[PDB]
Amino acid sequence: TQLDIVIVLDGSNSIYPWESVIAFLNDLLKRMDIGPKQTQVGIVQYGENVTHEFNLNKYSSTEEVLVAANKIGRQGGLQTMTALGIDTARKEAFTEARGARRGVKKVMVIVTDGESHDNYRLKQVIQDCEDENIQRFSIAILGHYNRGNLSTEKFVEEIKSIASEPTEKHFFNVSDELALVTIVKALGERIF
Numbered sequence: 001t002q003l004d005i006v007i008v009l010d011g012s013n014s015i016y017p018w019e020s021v022i023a024f025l026n027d028l029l030k031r032m033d034i035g036p037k038q039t040q041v042g043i044v045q046y047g048e049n050v051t052h053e054f055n056l057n058k059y060s061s062t063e064e065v066l067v068a069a070n071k072i073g074r075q076g077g078l079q080t081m082t083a084l085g086i087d088t089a090r091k092e093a094f095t096e097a098r099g100a101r102r103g104v105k106k107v108m109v110i111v112t113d114g115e116s117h118d119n120y121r122l123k124q125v126i127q128d129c130e131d132e133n134i135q136r137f138s139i140a141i142l143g144h145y146n147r148g149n150l151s152t153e154k155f156v157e158e159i160k161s162i163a164s165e166p167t168e169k170h171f172f173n174v175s176d177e178l179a180l181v182t183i184v185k186a187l188g189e190r191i192f
Helices: 016-030 061-071 084-091 119-131 141-148 153-160 178-182 184-191
Strands: 002-010 041-049 049-054 106-111 134-141 172-175
Touching: 002 016, 002 084, 016 061, 016 106, 016 178, 016 184, 041 084, 049 061, 049 084, 084 106, 084 119, 119 134, 119 172, 134 153, 134 184, 153 172
Parallel strands: 002 041, 002 106, 106 134, 134 172
Antiparallel strands: 041 049
8 A cells, every 4th residue: 555654763872772762663564564555664862853764765675664663773862853754754755856756645754752842842743743634643652651650641641642533543652662562563554
């Protein structure tokens, strides 16, 4: 199924077992059938700033893409700029220049473990996305917050608020990093 999908991975310092985010990425990708005629994948990591791990038209094989994604290291970040990452992915990753296919449904999968420093310009960033008809799946990892005995009330609401409607369908509330590889089935099917 022809689909352009961009992963917006929060690379702040709290998502601890980094290989666990990667294990998840691997787990979600190994299921897809990538190809210029069905499913395209791109990855952007963020935290303080944004970097494109790889464009939507960079790879053609589900396997090659697998090797590429497993070599992504934690960029690191004190600040978590989700508004900046999402806006950049909508502004950059999704361009014919970076691989985006003309009239192919655009989907975003954002993964994060904390409230955004860029909290405020979310409403504008999201509404723009919804205007550019971009289905969004937001996964909130409550690990660091639960380990630190902090409320996640507002954190879950802000992440819920990024997911395309219906929120109960695209938003994923994950307990911790390890429990990520148990959300691959529902995300991988609700997507395609």
